[PDB]
Amino acid sequence: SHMLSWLHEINSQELEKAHATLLGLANMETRYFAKKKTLLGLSKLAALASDFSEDMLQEKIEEMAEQERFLLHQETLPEQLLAEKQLNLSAMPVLTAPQLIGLYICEENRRANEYDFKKALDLLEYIDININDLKLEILCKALQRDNWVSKDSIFVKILLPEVKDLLQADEFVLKANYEYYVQGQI
């Protein structure tokens, strides 16, 4: 996908083609998050502006909605840790599900609430190493903040065999919760 191709295609009124190349550019992008969004947005507009049938169009806007879901996660990164990590507002690369989950649960991310973690458990399908290794590591730091409330709510938020027990500890209340979970999941 040549970076100038969509310009010539928009100019030639070839909007289905421009959409394809903009989607292409967007999928190649990693160096700038702001850029991937713009290209995606441009690609969505070309799709919307073009002569796709309502079927074909419906698909594109769908496979596009998926992509917008992923990006929505890096988009919503709390402003407290973007400053603590001295990060660049939009002058920053396209993070992966890994570096997000980790960064969404870092101890720099103070105010980490239910959603920060609920979202963190959503960024599991966007991976492609050990899966349940972090699956726990998160449910772990989901407690360190509880200062023995949230782990309660995150479970409230799931509706269950994905969580760990014996290996997690590797305890008074843990079991208490691991009891309410039983009556909940059953």
Binding site: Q13, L15, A34, L40, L42, K44, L45, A49
Partner: protein, 247 residues
């Protein structure tokens, strides 16, 4: 008949106990005026509404809705005020000094002077322009990304059916949002903010506000063609089509 509508507002406003009804009927009048782009008219009505009506009024759905609509109309009117000011200023741009090829020594000196004066006149002009530009962008974005559900969209679903109001508001969205989005592009592009022009494609295509539902296919094509023009200007600067450095 304008006066008949704009004046019946003086009547409703006379009686404080009737401020909610005054707000609602004023919103209705202004919805009609805005549909024909009669902003002085709408503003004429808008001012007649005591700047303190909202505070006093304090909630049936119709009234909650009327207050929000009222603030939506305020945001819109302001976007047009700032834009007229920006526009008027942009058309007072200082004229480059005229060259006298084969200038006499005297003409070289005069030209040196005018040239430096022009750089002053122009940098002042551009200074005000920057103030005006930043302000009109804030207003456009306020309407376009109107807080909590969208410009001319009810937050409150429990009001009684009013098919007229409801479709008037969908009309306003279709007349006013693409327009603002085009004005906004003119502003960004005119002042060399090409990268932000292209980010208009984000704003319009976003699921958050779903602005694209309000555009006809033809207006989306026009929008894309305009963004392409911004891209070309970015290519001439040695950047890529989205304004990022060519690595």
């Amino acid at each position: 008949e304008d006066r008949l509508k704009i004046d019946v507002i003086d009547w409703l406003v006379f009686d404080p106990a009737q401020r909610a009804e005054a707000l609602k009927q004023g919103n209705a009048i202004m919805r009609k005026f805005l549909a024909s782009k009669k902003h002085e008219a709408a503003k004429e009505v808008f001012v007649k509404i005591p700047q303190d009506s909202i505070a006093e009024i304090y909630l049936p759905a119709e009234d909650d809705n009327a207050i929000r609509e009222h603030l939506c109309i305020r945001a819109y009117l302001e976007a047009h005020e700032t834009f007229n000011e920006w526009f008027k200023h942009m058309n007072s741009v200082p004229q480059k000094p005229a060259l006298i090829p084969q200038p006499t020594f005297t003409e070289k000196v005069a030209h040196e002077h005018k040239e430096k004066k022009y750089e002053m006149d122009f940098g002042i002009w551009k200074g005000h322009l920057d103030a005006l530009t930043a302000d009109v962008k804030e207003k456009m974005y306020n309407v376009l990304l109107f807080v909590d559900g969208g410009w001319m969209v009810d937050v409150r679903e429990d009001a009684k059916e009013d098919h007229e109001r409801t479709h008037q508001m969908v009309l306003l969205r279709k007349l006013c949002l693409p327009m603002l989005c085009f004005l906004l592009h003119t502003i960004l592009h005119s002042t060399g903010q090409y990268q932000e022009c292209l980010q208009l494609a984000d704003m319009v295509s976003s699921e958050r506000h779903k602005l694209y539902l309000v555009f006809s296919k033809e207006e989306l094509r026009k929008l894309l063609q305009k963004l392409r023009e911004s891209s070309l200007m970015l290519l001439d600067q040695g950047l890529d089509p989205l304004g990022y450095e060519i690595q």
